[model samples]
Target: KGEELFTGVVPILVELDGDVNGHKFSVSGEGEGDATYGKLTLKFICTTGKLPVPWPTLVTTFVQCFSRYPDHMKRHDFFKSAMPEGYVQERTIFFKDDGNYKTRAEVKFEGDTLVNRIELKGIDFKEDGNILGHKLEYNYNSHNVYIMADKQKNGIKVNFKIRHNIEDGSVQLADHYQQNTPIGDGPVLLPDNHYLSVQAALSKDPNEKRDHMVLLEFVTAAGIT
Candidate 1:
């Protein structure tokens, strides 16, 4: 069913359901499952676009970090114990191809707006010697996000400001010198004491929840400020 539907012409529909942080999330045709590489059957689920839902969006976004690399099995063990608070890894599946896994995250609110704080910790980077190999440690303290709804339009907007405490001083210095070079995009400011600004908005159709995913994609462009 999976191979037949996603042959080449149009997008295929796949169902996804899983447990995260003791919270059960269900979404039909919102994810994909693969059983290609022997007995390991991997499932990738998409997060619900509903507001006030944290587990779905959090898990979906976190899993995306794995898709960027080719060897999922070798790197899967690293993420097993590196999830944020109130979140746990339920399952992980790998795809032989690229752009096979994708998801949308939504945060909405009622009358008065509320702030959702998400913190991701224990991210340890292994030296693969691909692009300047060095012991890299990523320590993200917390993600301060502001979520609100537009009463007149009935949509949600999210403004995310983040801070990262990187321990690799040598790598940090190298990146600093590279950005400081008068060639492309001036100096890259180190985000230690100050918070980096990242803003995103989501406008979904009031009648349709599945259509909400379509509205997730927005322009994300950032630079040193």
Candidate 2:
């Protein structure tokens, strides 16, 4: 439950030297000489309308930002035995058409989920549907607000500045946090550059609150990861 190994935005080759399904497999691209050559770069795309990381946004935030957290793969057998089918990245010539660069997939959780047409450039960005069952919203928030909530693993920072316009005094929780006591109006002064964990949509409950394990499926499928 607490192991941190390959957790970062650093670009490099991640090769696996082992066998899967009786086939000898090797993924070497980071080593003395064999490992020094870097060709794997991960460019995240969501129904073409997304960007982010995995584990919990919190889990990933800490796991990647800190040196002490576990990768959670330790729960390997358990997750595979219990969780939903995972996504697999499928490649196409379109994305590879532009004097292309190669990519990497270090996350092989061994599940049966779908890996939709992710890397391929589609007919148009206007197309709303994608494999993960996420659709691109034709209209997006004109006023975009990005927030970063971070602190030690043990202590909640609790310090936050409202981005964009602070209409209300109450501090809003990620779509997951519910109607807590309002934090009062924020006459917050604003700035740019930011963002999190996901969930929301004006529903009565927003149907956003979900169990971590239950949520991973949606998070990953929605490209929130």
Candidate 3:
């Protein structure tokens, strides 16, 4: 019944210590934690400016991240009692492959209770080293729009753009955000160059209005960081 050491949102930067089977790996993001009773927790709400990558990796990575604390904290009974876990909300969309379509896909999250993200597990890009089975998240806040990618050997390459439209001009939201990635070849990390600008969009407004629509055109092949 005491105050928790870490609460609310804590920004984290963790780098994998040894060789990641020969590849260096690191995760820098902001996580939400409520170290209360029952499910004492710390779940990453956003990796950098977007959602975390590779659901499975976080399970193991979180333990390593937590261990970086001092021994007193690490060995504490309360801290040890609660282990970190991974749970993705239903606001996400999972894709499937039917061996039919291969050009591009258009999807939308029309309601307010949705997070604009997708899991590409089944859709095969038919390339040698394509990231056809990774997760991606698209989000905009304050003044920047982010495109997040999962942990992969080489990040996926794609032509990405977002269309944000409102029902009426009376609302103060942007008509459409147009700072697209004609070709992006790096990881979308914290304050990375891959982030888009809200002011540079079709309309320069940053406010949110009701009945606003967001359309995503995400097409992928083989490439990136």
Candidate 4:
């Protein structure tokens, strides 16, 4: 029988030091000490640069806002994480395209087991970039309210409001409704020359007696909703 040559076996180390195809190459000579020589060269191509990270200022502001209203932590976290650093600018694009903007605010119960109320404010932009605002306010006790959009070429105004009772996870707007009164601090009030308060409400149950009701308000200024 012929002597067997172990073709399956290879040396343990090899060395190379010159340029190949005009490209210089180098290998470390300080490896394990052994007579065997085997080496495999690998060209590791890499890239390094800075990428856009989330803005720390905005994150800090949101965290502080949630800390004051700890009950809304879950919703706050969800909204914050779902949004990038420039949330307002991104949302403005949607309003510009569809001529509408939707604001979803929720007040969650302790431990996020249930929500106390959810206010959904919708703003429809007019041809001149003015907003016509509507709101759908829903509460835990199956109460639902619809606040209609008001139109005025000059002064601030709120038009009509209606209510409903929830049934089987659904709420139908009740025929019972009322016109918005011109209260001094009502939703239609102008906060400043540039900004107008479009919606304001307490997180408390309107039908019940509650002492600790948190209030939230929304405003729009110029063409920046």
lDDT of each: 0.23, 0.19, 0.22, 0.21
* 1 versus 4: better TM-score goes to: 1
- lDDT score for residue 65 of model 3: 15
Q: What TM-score goes with each of the models? A: 0.22, 0.17, 0.21, 0.18
Query: Which is the winner by lDDT between candidate 1 and candidate 2?
Result: 1
- List, residue by residue over 1-225, the lDDT tens digit for candidate 1: 111221222221323443432234554332221212111112223455432222123222322111111232322211111211111112121111110112222211111211111222211222232111322232223233233332232222323422222344432211100000011122211121111122222233356634233212111112213
The runs of at least 3 residues in candidate 1 whose Cα sits more than 4 Å from the true structure, single-residue gaps closed, are: 1-9, 30-52, 55-201, 209-212, 215-225
Residue 52's C-alpha lDDT in candidate 3? 19
> Best candidate, TM-score-wise?
1
For model 1, give the 10-residue run with minimal summed lDDT: 173-182
Q: Whole-model lDDT for model 4 versus the true structure? A: 0.21
Candidate 4, position 106, lDDT: 30
Model 3 agreement with the true structure over 1-225: per-residue lDDT tens digits:
111223332223222221111222233322222222111122222223322132222221221111122323322222212212111211112212211111111111123111112222222232221112222222322333333332242221212222222223221222221111111232222111233222211111146332121221111111113
lDDT of 2 at 98: 15
The C-alpha stretches of model 4 lying farther than 4 A from their native spots are: 1-157, 160-167, 172-212, 221-225
Per-residue error (Å), model 1, residue 35: 23
TM-score of 4: 0.18
Tell me each candidate's RMSD, in Å, in order.
21.9, 20.5, 20.1, 31.4
For candidate 2, lDDT tens digit of each residue in 123-147?
A: 2211221211222221112222132
Q: lDDT, candidate 3, residue 51? A: 21
